[PDB]
Amino acid sequence: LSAASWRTQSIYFLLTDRFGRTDNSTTATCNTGNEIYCGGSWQGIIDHLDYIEGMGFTAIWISPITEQLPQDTADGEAYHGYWQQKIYDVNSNFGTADNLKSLSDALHARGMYLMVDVVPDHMGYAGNGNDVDYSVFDPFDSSSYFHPYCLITDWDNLTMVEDCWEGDTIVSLPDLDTTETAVRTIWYDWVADLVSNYSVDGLRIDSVLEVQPDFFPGYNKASGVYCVGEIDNGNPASDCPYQKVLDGVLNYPIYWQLLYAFESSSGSISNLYNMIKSVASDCSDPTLLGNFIENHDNPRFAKYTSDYSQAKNVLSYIFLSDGIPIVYAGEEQHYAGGKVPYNREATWLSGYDTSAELYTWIATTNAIRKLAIAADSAYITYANDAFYTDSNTIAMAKGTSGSQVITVLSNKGSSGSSYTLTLSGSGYTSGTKLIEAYTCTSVTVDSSGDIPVPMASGLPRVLLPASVVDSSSLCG
């Protein structure tokens, strides 16, 4: 699928090793601090696709698929897929090639998409960079395709960042020399064939900051599908310019500010609003960014606050602002894991409870997003406008005039206190009929052009023309 078509998708990110077992167990032990394989497979995913599909996701993002280093170390095992050694083989722990193709077919058969995580930057090696045995790698069995060993010592130094090696002294990450024609060739063929053999619909690229930007255009082009890169940094000025060579980037700038605005009743709304404006100014298409509020590399949102109203609000935000929403398996179950590896809890230990508070919230949010898209073809590409803010509130408008969706967010918390807010600035006129989708409340705009918004227990509120909701069954 191309970038333009990816815009209307919703993705569930899971760690192949942590989501589901081929034996369907709900009880298989998984001590995270141990950093070993707990046993998830591509068949375990297939086996729980109903679970995923009931929250209304259209796509999944899975861990890398290549064969890894086989050892156990004080750094743990390669259960995450980021320590590869032989690229033309599969991670036999996850299953067989046939199994990977069956995942692809099972998804497509449901109207779902497959997104795969890929690592162009490095190889993995159980030993320090001085003693790497290049004979273990396929096809890169020569120290010649790699950059000279150095650790990344100074992160402000972008050359050093691109040319020295990720990792430490227990498990080193042999850094490929991606400027070399032979390594661009290997990699461009490799990604065209990956897509063609397993029918991938889109790619998630690891360590984009660690690769020179000119590598990316012929890699985007050889794969023939949307590419979203990981540039792990909070500065839009550093990660937006990559949108010049990739298509999309993961929305790390918004991540940090969303997290803090919502962790408490005193979190900063100003900070969020300013970051919206900065990204819209540096990024060529914010609607092509991957939005998230948790992932496998930072503490879980529930580790900072266990308030459910705060949790609902960051979820409405990822789905209803500009960009593609991405939920990290566990999120829907209110997983509380902190620092890595504490945040890599097995989903199966939740028992796949489809009646969890957040399971339901995401399913309703997904319905809403799908309704808006179905009703205004210019909705998804329309730029988001944060039109009102106060110390605990942000209201945003998106969609064609006469049709815009209005989203109202609050960081007051469960403590809340019911009141009505008179939202000015919507662009809707006097007497327009709206329906608040989460409560099914019908409201009429003021003679002055105000929307009286019923606020309670600091929960999100979303309004669409009554007309539209009346054409669905969000509201009976």
Q: Please report, in range form, the residues annotated as the binding site for Ca(2+).
A: 121, 162, 175, 206, 210, 230
Say which of 35, 163, 230, 376 is annotated catalytic: 230
- Point out which span in 83-91, 195-203, 207-215, 305-313 binds Ca ion (CB under 5 A): 207-215
Those residues whose C-beta lies under 8 Å from the C-beta of residue 468, and which sit 6 or more positions away, are: 371, 372, 375, 403
Q: Mark the binding-site residues for substrate, compressed into ranges.
A: 83, 122, 204, 209-210, 234, 297, 344
Cis? peptide before 460, omega within 30° of 0: no
The residue (of 175 and 294) whose beta carbon lies closer to Ca ion is 175
Q: Are 230 and 256 in contact (CB under 8 A)?
A: no
Closest to 428 measured CA to CA, from 473, 467, 373, 370: 467
Q: Are 72 and 37 in contact (CB under 8 A)?
A: no
Q: Count CB-CB contacts under 10 A for residue 285.
A: 17
Terminal CA-to-CA distance of the chain, rounded, Å?
34
Say which of 17, 67, 206, 307 is annotated catalytic: 206
Closest to 6 measured CA to CA, from 295, 192, 225, 249: 225
Q: Which amino acid is at 410?
A: S
- Dist CA 101 CA 105 (whole Å): 6
Q: Which amino acid is at 47?
A: D
Residue 345 interacts with Ca ion (CB under 5 A): yes or no: no
Q: Name which position in 17, 210, 239, 247 contacts Ca ion (CB under 5 A).
A: 210
Smallest distance from Ca ion to CB 40, Å: 19
Residue 134 DSSP code: G
Describe the chain by its helix, strand, coil percentages, rounded to 5: 35, 20, 45
Q: Does residue 206 have an active-site annotation?
A: yes
Q: Does residue 35 have an active-site annotation?
A: no
Residue with CB nearest Ca ion?
A: 210
Structure tokens belonging to residue 198: 């397993």
Write out the H or E segment, with its range, that includes residue 181: helix 181-198
Smallest distance from Ca ion to CB 211, Å: 5
Breaks (C-N over 2.5 A) in the chain follow: none
Q: Are 165 and 154 in contact (CB under 8 A)?
A: no
The residue (of 94 and 145) whose beta carbon lies closer to Ca ion is 145
Q: Mark the binding-site residues, compressed into ranges.
A: 83, 121-122, 162, 175, 204, 206, 209-210, 230, 234, 297, 344
The residue (of 210 and 294) whose beta carbon lies closer to Ca ion is 210
Smallest distance from Ca ion to CB 76, Å: 15
Alpha helical stretches, state H, 119-180: 158-163
The residue (of 145 and 428) whose beta carbon lies closer to Ca ion is 145
The residue (of 204 and 312) whose beta carbon lies closer to Ca ion is 204
Q: Name which position in 67, 175, 239, 322 contacts Ca ion (CB under 5 A).
A: 175
The residue (of 293 and 463) whose beta carbon lies closer to Ca ion is 293
Q: Count CB-CB contacts under 10 A for residue 244.
A: 11
- Point out which span in 3-11, 184-192, 209-217, 347-355 binds Ca ion (CB under 5 A): 209-217
Smallest distance from Ca ion to CB 473, Å: 41
Q: Find the helix packing angle between 308-320 and 252-262, rounded to 10°.
A: 150
Contacts with Ca ion: how many residues (CB under 5 A)?
A: 4
Smallest distance from Ca ion to CB 293, Å: 17
**Contact track, Ca ion, 84-123, x by CB under 5 A:** -------------------------------------x--
Smallest distance from Ca ion to CB 419, Å: 43
The catalytic residues are 206, 230
Interface residues with Ca ion (CB under 5 A) are 121, 175, 206, 210
